[PDB]
Amino acid sequence: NPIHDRTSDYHKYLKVKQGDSDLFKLTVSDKRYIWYNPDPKERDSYECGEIVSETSDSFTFKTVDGQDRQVKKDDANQRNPIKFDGVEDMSELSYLNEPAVFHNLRVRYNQDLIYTYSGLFLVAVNPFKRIPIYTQEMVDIFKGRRRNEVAPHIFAISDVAYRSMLDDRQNQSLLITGESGAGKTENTKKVIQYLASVAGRNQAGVLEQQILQANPILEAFGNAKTTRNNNSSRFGKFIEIQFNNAGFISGASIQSYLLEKSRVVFQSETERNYHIFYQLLAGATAEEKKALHLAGPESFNYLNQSGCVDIKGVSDSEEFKITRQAMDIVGFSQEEQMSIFKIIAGILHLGNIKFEKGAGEGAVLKDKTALNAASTVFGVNPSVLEKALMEPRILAGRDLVAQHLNVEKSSSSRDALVKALYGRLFLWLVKKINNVLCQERKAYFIGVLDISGFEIFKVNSFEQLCINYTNEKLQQFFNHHMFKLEQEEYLKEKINLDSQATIDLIDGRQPPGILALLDEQSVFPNATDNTLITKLHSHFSKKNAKYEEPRFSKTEFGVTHYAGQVMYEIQDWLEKNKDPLQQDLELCFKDSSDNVVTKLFNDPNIASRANFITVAAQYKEQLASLMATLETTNPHFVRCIIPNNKQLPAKLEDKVVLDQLRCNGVLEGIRITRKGFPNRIIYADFVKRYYLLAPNVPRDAEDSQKATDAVLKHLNIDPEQYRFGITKIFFRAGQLARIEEARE
């Protein structure tokens, strides 16, 4: 039992190493410390200052330099006694201030202990290196163990959700959010790997194989290299792991959101297009290439702009194999696989189209090779395509007339065509996969939500508002949930707001919110970004307290989010909301001779949204559904945190980290918690550590509750500082630290 074997890898990688003795005596010391800012030029940079003296109202402590400063007791961030250094649950700390919290996280992280609880949360910090704690062996240790019985681990919360599902006969949810590169997806894959094991139908598994093989498929199409993550997820997802009344995996379903279709036509420097592009180009057989008119990435416009065409220690060729492999296992037919690859190719071809002017103002195609190539793989008619691109027929009321798009207009159209194809192909992929895994007759499920937390970038656009909108709802969801659970707890032992405004500003109907005004402008073909922003400011500037019209910028506005103020840029929102594609383009492709292509343009479930609804309306709608589902589950929350902005191990940056804990609900949670009775200990537990503090008690006593009172009494503790619970002694902030600080 590696849990009891101090030499196992379990101990080594997941636990603070334990010595011989456990005696209270060991950690004894007369020094009392404080957390301070070496200078407010910072604020998250703190240093330990030892209290050299104090007054009835404040503390005097020396700095690192040996400089004596003074602080108000009421403004002091006292340091927890060394015993608390490394605890598995932040809720275990007596002094619960920010620096303290970071400290505990740091201490653990300096031992490569990437996982820590914080009350209801599991906090996970990316190590940025490998930690072999995800073996089958590792899997085996977490089986059926209580949270309190084992080290913190993604496997632990996975086991807890699984058991609750079986014990309560209630669906479950795991929300894993945070910053790009934080490790959401990796953790999400662990969750599934664990479930697949503890609930998979042994012997050897197939359904399970299919399930496992799904991600790989999706990652190839929805993940790309960005400056923040080599394997960034460019879409959000909710994974539903389906179980039967017996607790055996019976299927799964996937819901995808917000795919960055734009990445197909443009990538920042150093970044890469979607993995598959590279996979195909590298892995395709010298024969398939010829049939696909494939060349190197350099020879393609959509792959030769960022300067990066490969990932460090990544074989696109070998990845391709993996990718086809999965396709094979899920069930994609060889034909289907071709068309997909054909779509991939054709897209590349479309991007290699060069529109030229001259003649007049209207676009022309001197060379048609690219066009020919894309038409062949797509299996459409080049002439129709050509026309559809440069001369779409447009309705001017009663008049349906073909226009002569200029180059720019022509090009954007091509781009629109490419993005429509990519996104629909993605949608189709998901649907196919679901057809194979999904069960219309599940008993229970565990859903995993792997999506980014709030996004606060240099530049924030429509997509950011969206994800930011989702996060307001998720955070509100946590808050409500934290409310009920804390209430229960206090009630089982015998003891004793804010997000809607932001949400309403965004999705309200009457008065109309941001999204509603967006939609309204959306009907007007001639509306512009300016008409739009004016409208916005016109309804909220100085009117809505969550809204801010910029001092000078004419294209932005801010919203006060849970995380803080975010400044948004309006450019192209109108276009994003409609996501237009020239009708003739639809017509061209509707006649495709390709079997997959036909589906993308002929299946209303794939070729359209909802007369039809806007992109905003659909986002709202899909978010409501999502929330509805979650509502019906018992949720579990995982906060993946990025130690720094450089993808470096052993480099935990206080400011980077702290800003993440600020925005993700962790510090709030603590603040709230710290205000009541943060520390809640089991009687026996308490006595077992402190018995020697009172001339009365023996380590293991039968009347633990009485024994507790004894010490307390002995120590003459302030009655309002604690609360006798049915099975726990509840302590207010700092109390337990002091007690700890008591002499034997």
For Mg ion, the closer of residues 219 and 548 by Cβ is 219
| Nearest CA-CA partner of 468 in 489, 487, 482, 453 | 453
For Mg ion, the closer of residues 185 and 339 by Cβ is 185
Burial, 13: exposed, middle or buried (Cβ in 10 Å; 0-12, 13-18, 19+)?
middle
Burial, 322: exposed, middle or buried (Cβ in 10 Å; 0-12, 13-18, 19+)?
middle
For Mg ion, the closer of residues 181 and 392 by Cβ is 181
Residue 187 designated active-site: no
Residue 592 designated active-site: no
Cβ-closest position to Mg ion: 233
Q: CB-based contacts of 153: which residues, under 8 Å, 6+ apart? A: 14, 115, 133, 138, 142
Residue 202 designated active-site: no
Residue 29 designated active-site: no
The stretch near Mg ion (CB under 5 A) out of 11-19, 183-191, 388-396, 708-716 is 183-191
Distance of closest approach, residue 215 Cβ to Mg ion, in angstroms = 10
What single-letter DSSP state applies at residue 364?
B
Which residues within the stretch 694-713 sit at the binding site for Mg ion (CB under 5 A)? none
Say if residues 240 and 432 touch (Cβ distance below 8 Å).
Answer: no
Q: Is 345 known to sit in a ligand binding site?
A: no
Catalytic residue among 455, 472, 548, 740: 455
- The alpha carbon torsion through 560, 562, 564, 565 (nearest 10 deg) reads -20
Burial, 620: exposed, middle or buried (Cβ in 10 Å; 0-12, 13-18, 19+)?
buried
The stretch near Mg ion (CB under 5 A) out of 61-69, 99-107, 181-189, 337-345 is 181-189
Distance of closest approach, residue 126 Cβ to Mg ion, in angstroms = 12
Task: Count the residues of the shown chain that bind Mg ion, applying the rule CB under 5 A.
Answer: 3
Distance between CA atoms of residues 266 and 348, nearest Å: 12
| Sheet hosting strand 564-569, strand order edge to edge | 547-548, 556-561, 564-569
What single-letter DSSP state applies at residue 356?
B
The stretch near Mg ion (CB under 5 A) out of 146-154, 182-190, 355-363, 440-448 is 182-190
Which residues within the stretch 225-244 sit at the binding site for Mg ion (CB under 5 A)? 233
For Mg ion, the closer of residues 173 and 185 by Cβ is 185
For Mg ion, the closer of residues 314 and 384 by Cβ is 314
**3-class secondary-structure state, position 233:** strand
| 185 forms part of the interface with Mg ion (CB under 5 A) | yes
Q: Is 247 known to sit in a ligand binding site?
A: no
Distance of closest approach, residue 464 Cβ to Mg ion, in angstroms = 16
Say if residues 467 and 455 touch (Cβ distance below 8 Å).
Answer: yes
Distance of closest approach, residue 106 Cβ to Mg ion, in angstroms = 25
| C-alpha triplet 296, 298, 299: angle, nearest 5° | 70
Distance between CA atoms of residues 137 and 148, nearest Å: 20
For Mg ion, the closer of residues 238 and 731 by Cβ is 238
Distance of closest approach, residue 259 Cβ to Mg ion, in angstroms = 13
Catalytic residue among 223, 226, 229, 256: 229
Distance between CA atoms of residues 436 and 442, nearest Å: 14
For Mg ion, the closer of residues 239 and 390 by Cβ is 239
Burial, 123: exposed, middle or buried (Cβ in 10 Å; 0-12, 13-18, 19+)?
buried
Residue 229 designated active-site: yes
Burial, 636: exposed, middle or buried (Cβ in 10 Å; 0-12, 13-18, 19+)?
buried
| 273 forms part of the interface with Mg ion (CB under 5 A) | no
Q: Is 180 known to sit in a ligand binding site?
A: yes
Residue 232 designated active-site: yes
Distance of closest approach, residue 620 Cβ to Mg ion, in angstroms = 23
Q: Is 185 known to sit in a ligand binding site?
A: yes
Catalytic residue among 351, 447, 453, 669: 453
Distance of closest approach, residue 233 Cβ to Mg ion, in angstroms = 3
Distance of closest approach, residue 318 Cβ to Mg ion, in angstroms = 21
Distance of closest approach, residue 626 Cβ to Mg ion, in angstroms = 17
Catalytic residue among 37, 45, 58, 180: 180
Residue 455 designated active-site: yes
Say if residues 270 and 331 touch (Cβ distance below 8 Å).
Answer: no
Burial, 80: exposed, middle or buried (Cβ in 10 Å; 0-12, 13-18, 19+)?
buried
| Token code pair at residue 114 | 């990437």
Q: What are phi and psi of 239, to 5 degrees?
A: -100, 120
Q: Is 397 known to sit in a ligand binding site?
A: no
For Mg ion, the closer of residues 185 and 544 by Cβ is 185
For Mg ion, the closer of residues 413 and 452 by Cβ is 452
Q: Is 628 known to sit in a ligand binding site?
A: no
Distance of closest approach, residue 465 Cβ to Mg ion, in angstroms = 20
Say if residues 353 and 371 touch (Cβ distance below 8 Å).
Answer: yes
Catalytic residue among 49, 86, 181, 283: 181
The stretch near Mg ion (CB under 5 A) out of 177-185, 346-354, 491-499, 513-521 is 177-185
What spatial distance separates the first Cα and last Cα of the chain, rounded to whole Å? 34
| 126 forms part of the interface with Mg ion (CB under 5 A) | no
Residue 173 designated active-site: no
For Mg ion, the closer of residues 158 and 185 by Cβ is 185
Q: Is 184 known to sit in a ligand binding site?
A: yes
| C-alpha triplet 339, 342, 345: angle, nearest 5° | 160
Write each residue from 96 to 115 as x if it is in contact with Mg ion (CB under 5 A), else as -, in one continuous string.
Answer: --------------------
**3-class secondary-structure state, position 677:** coil
Distance between CA atoms of residues 317 and 349, nearest Å: 21
Catalytic residue among 77, 187, 233, 273: 233
Q: Is 251 known to sit in a ligand binding site?
A: no
Which residues within the stretch 524-563 sit at the binding site for Mg ion (CB under 5 A)? none
DSSP string, 235-293: SEEEEEEEE-TTS-EEEEEEEEE---GGGGT---TT--SBHHHHHHHHHS-HHHHHHHT
Q: What are phi and psi of 514, to 5 degrees?
A: -55, -55
Strand partners, 122: 117, 638
For Mg ion, the closer of residues 218 and 663 by Cβ is 218
The stretch near Mg ion (CB under 5 A) out of 176-184, 273-281, 404-412, 658-666 is 176-184
User: Residue 198: enclosing H or E segment and its boundaries?
Assistant: helix 184-198
The stretch near Mg ion (CB under 5 A) out of 151-159, 178-186, 291-299, 571-579 is 178-186
Distance of closest approach, residue 329 Cβ to Mg ion, in angstroms = 22
| Token code pair at residue 149 | 């019985």
Distance between CA atoms of residues 133 and 129, nearest Å: 12
Binding-site residues from annotation for ATP: 178-185
Binding-site residues from annotation: 178-185
Question: Residues interacting with Mg ion, by CB under 5 A?
Answer: 184-185, 233
Residues with active-site annotation: 180-181, 185, 229, 232-233, 453, 455
